[PDB]
Amino acid sequence: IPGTPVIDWADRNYALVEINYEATAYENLIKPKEQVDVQVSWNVWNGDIGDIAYVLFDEQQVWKGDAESKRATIKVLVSGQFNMRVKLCNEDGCSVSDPVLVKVADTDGGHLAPLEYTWLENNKPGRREDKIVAAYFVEWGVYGRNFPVDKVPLPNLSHLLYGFIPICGGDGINDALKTISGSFESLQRSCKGREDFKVAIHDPWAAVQKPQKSVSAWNEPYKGNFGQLMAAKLANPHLKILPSIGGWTLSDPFYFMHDVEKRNVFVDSVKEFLQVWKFFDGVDVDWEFPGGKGANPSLGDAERDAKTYILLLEELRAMLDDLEAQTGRVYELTSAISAGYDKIAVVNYAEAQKSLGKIFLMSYDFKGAWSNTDLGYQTTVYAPSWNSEELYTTHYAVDALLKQGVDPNKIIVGVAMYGRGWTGVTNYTNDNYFSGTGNGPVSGTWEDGVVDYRQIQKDLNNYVYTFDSAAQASYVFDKSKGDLISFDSVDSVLGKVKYVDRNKLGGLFAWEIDADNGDLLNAINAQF
Ligand SMILES: CC(=O)N[C@@H]1[C@@H](O)[C@H](O[C@@H]2O[C@H](CO)[C@@H](O)[C@H](O)[C@H]2NC(C)=O)[C@@H](CO)O[C@H]1O
Ligand SMILES: CC(=O)N[C@@H]1[C@@H](O)[C@H](O)[C@@H](CO)O[C@H]1O
Ligand SMILES: CC(=O)N[C@@H]1[C@@H](O)[C@H](O)[C@@H](CO)O[C@H]1O
Ligand SMILES: CC(=O)N[C@@H]1[C@@H](O)[C@H](O)[C@@H](CO)O[C@H]1O
Ligand SMILES: [Cl-]
Ligand SMILES: [Cl-]
Question: How many domains does the chain have?
């Protein structure tokens, strides 16, 4: 028998996608790899080197070669952990080394352990499984809001939408970003040396670099929101995770995509992004909005954008089908859309739904502190009791989509987990505050004019509360400060559940998950 082989000490943690934990540019951040090369070297003690050498992974042969070299190199394609041994043979028989643990990491989380949700606040088990129940998780919530992925009530969600994946571009291309201090500068860093119109990550620190629960080791392959999402998917195998591209301030590049050159760069970038970040199950298109009236007033062209949107969806669906065939997986394609009828009219949704599995109707932000004059329900199902002629309602938006021929199955109704409101509202009559005028935005939790649902509850005693059962909408008022806030409550949300059930819609989705204390998400999952 040959001498006993002993494997040399080595870093044996490998990554099919390498992360530079100091990089700020997306192109330095990741190093995607075809394969990983597992390296082993050994020495032989008390006997001969053997006539032949084998490498075993969990007692399966993965290499044979020269015993005299005392070295082997083994190609590995997929993530996982396994025991590696060296086995030396001669005519007599074999001697085997002690095993070493080898770890190959990849973005499907194959090297990870499940990250389970511990039940926080008022959240309660029970998920409505015959409907779409989705929520947006915002990338930047890991800061002030202190809401990392591990606080997300994933057992009660069918879908988690990651907001937001940006499109690369500087001056002229992401000007909307300039309305938020540092936001445009931050994106420029992330896209440094990266071609315009490619997808990237806005905050690679929050996305992958920041230590978080269960991904905080010194040599952790993937940290941040992304690392947490890989692990959380293992704990919640029902869940689908979608990268959401665009949103209010990141939508500008879409307006340039009538040009097939830029559109091609974008679609290819998306394809590469999903191959790099295996934990995503598709793509959510959140263009705000075809036709304009988004964060950037200069932008928008109705006839041109309606076609761009259709073309873009078609090409994304065709790309996603290639991925499906190539990986054996099922990839979704969705879009978040305005619930304003004047924005809905821009787009042929009967044509769009030929590429889309779901449409996230953004039935909120109907009204807000951008105007002191136009006071009303920021979200609501029907027209208010005091104004039966309101068109900015969930019912009208849904009706408009139905009239266009959209399957009601594909329509997902939006729930705001925050309120929009005004301060100092006066010059009104008969305690109808909505006939008054505001003196500015209500003081806000994180931004002014907007209040987390959780903050609203904590502050309930400061307010007189009103439900409008005709409209299925709620609000609060504090004469003391003249504070008026319209928001989704347990009542109005149950209203929306009833509305969705009655009209056979696809389900509901919330914006944004960190603002809830569990009340609203429980309500969303209520089954009648
Ligand atoms: C009906 C409507 O949306 N009116 C416009 C407002 O929406 C818009 O404010 C923005 O609404 C977005 C929701 O779709 C928010 O995410 C966005 O944050 C909010 N505004 C700001 C500054 O944050 C305003 C522009 O403020 O214009 C209205 O006409
Ligand atoms: C960065 C890193 O992973 N370092 C190594 C790891 O590879 C090795 O497997 C382990 C002992 O096996 O000791 C660690 O220090
Ligand atoms: C990315 C992840 O965590 N899990 C996916 C899973 O969604 C999919 O069903 C499966 C099919 O191959 O591929 C896994 O990688
Ligand atoms: C931002 C805004 O207030 N837009 C108004 C909306 O309030 C109104 O209900 C509807 C009337 O058609 O559309 C717009 O004129
Ligand atoms: Cl860098
Ligand atoms: Cl390697």
Answer: 3
Q: Of the ligands numbered here, which is closest to the C-alpha atom of 13?
A: 2
| CA nearest ligand 2 atom 2, residue | 11
Q: Is there a single domain that holds both residue 283 and residue 423?
A: no
Q: Which of 7, 8, 12 maximizes ligand 2 atoms within 8 Å of its Cβ, making it the mutation to test the pocket?
A: 12
332 with 351, same domain: the answer is yes
For residue 315, what are the domain limits? 105-416+491-528
Q: Which two tokens stand for residue 137?
A: 């998780």
Q: Give Cα separations from 434 to 363, 380, 396, 470 (angstroms).
A: 20, 14, 20, 16
Give the ligand 3 atom nearest the CA of 233. Answer: 3
Ligand nearest to the CA of 387: 4
Inter-axis angle of helices 394-403 and 490-502, nearest 10 = 20
Give nearest CA residue, ligand 4 atom 8: 392
Measured from the Cβ of residue 456, the count of other Cβ atoms closer than 10 Å reads: 25
**Positive/negative CA dihedral, 235, 239, 242, 247:** negative
Do 207 and 186 have their domain in common?
yes
Q: Which atom of ligand 2 is nearest to the CA of 103?
A: 9
Burial class (CB in 10 A: 0-12, 13-18, 19+), 373: exposed
Question: Residue 485: which residues within 8 A CB-CB, separation 6 or more?
Answer: 419, 420, 421, 442, 451, 456, 463, 475, 476, 477
CATH number at residue 23: 2.60.40.10
Mutate to test the pocket of ligand 1, among 164, 250, 365 (most ligand atoms within 8 A of CB): 365
Q: Taking each helix axis from N to C terminus, what angle separates 260-276 and 302-327, rounded to the nearest 10 degrees?
A: 30
Question: Cβ of 101: how many Cβ atoms within 10 Å?
Answer: 10
Way the structure was solved? X-ray
Q: Which residues make Cβ contacts (< 8 Å) with residue 69, sequence separation at least 6? A: 53
How does 240-254 read in b/e, with b if 16+ C-beta sit within 10 Å? Answer: bbbbbbbbbbbbbbb
Burial of 93 (0-12, 13-18, 19+ CB in 10 A): exposed
